[PDB]
A paper describes a structure:
The sequence conservation among the TgDCX orthologues is mostly restricted to the predicted P25α and doublecortin domains. Both the full-length TgDCX and the TgDCX71–243 fragment are insoluble in non-denaturing buffer systems, but we were able to purify and crystallize a soluble fragment (AA148–243) that contains the DCX domain and determine its structure by X-ray crystallography. The fold of TgDCX148–243 is very similar to that of the N-terminal DCX domain of human doublecortin, which itself is quite similar (root mean square distance (rmsd) of ~ 2 Å) to the doublecortin C-terminal DCX domain [HsDCX-N and HsDCX-C,]. Residues responsible for the four tubulin contact regions between HsDCX-N and tubulin identified by structural docking are in most cases similar. Given the high level of homology among the TgDCX orthologues in the region of their DCX domains, we used the structure of TgDCX148–243 as a model for threading the corresponding regions in the TgDCX orthologues in Chromera velia (CvDCX1, CvDCX2, CvDCX3), Vitrella brassicaformis (VbDCX1, VbDCX2, VbDCX3), Plasmodium falciparum (PfDCX), and Trichoplax adhaerens (TaDCX). At the location reported in corresponding to tubulin contact region #3 in HsDCX-N (K53), which abuts a strongly electronegative patch on β-tubulin, orthologues that bind efficiently to microtubules have a positive charge (R152 in TgDCX, lysine in CvDCX1 and PfDCX), whereas most of the orthologues that do not bind have isoleucine. The comparison of orthologues also revealed a reversal of polarity at one position: D201 in TgDCX and D at the corresponding location in CvDCX1 and PfDCX, is replaced by K or R at the corresponding residue in CvDCX2, CvDCX3, VbDCX2, VbDCX3, and TaDCX. Both sidechains however are orientated away from the microtubule, indicating that they are not directly involved in tubulin binding. Indeed, mutations at these two residues in TgDCX (R152I_D201R) and in a non-binding orthologue CvDCX2 (I85R_R134D) do not appreciably decrease TgDCX binding to microtubules nor increase CvDCX2 binding in Xenopus S3 Cells. When expressed in Toxoplasma (whether in the wild-type or in the TgDCX knockout background), mCherryFP-TgDCX148–243 was not enriched in the conoid.
Numbering used by the authors: 148 to 239
Write the structure that this text describes.
Amino acid sequence: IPAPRLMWLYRNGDKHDDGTPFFVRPYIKSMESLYQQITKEITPIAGPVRRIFDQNFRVITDLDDIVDGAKYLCTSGEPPAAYDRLEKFLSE
């Protein structure tokens, strides 16, 4: 049983978002449960979170795929924002 993994959450389309740290507690078992807790934290101006992308724009489909310390782009069902809005999300 791992310790709670850390996600650096980025608000889709908010080019000034410097990232919001979020700890995935071990009880979270479904994606919708995770989306709900993430929505509470970052409150996207486009509605509750429905999609989370890693920095290679792969959609997260299961909790086991989350990487401690990785950065994630959260959308409300829209595609990722234009590239020039993604500089902070995409920086190493």
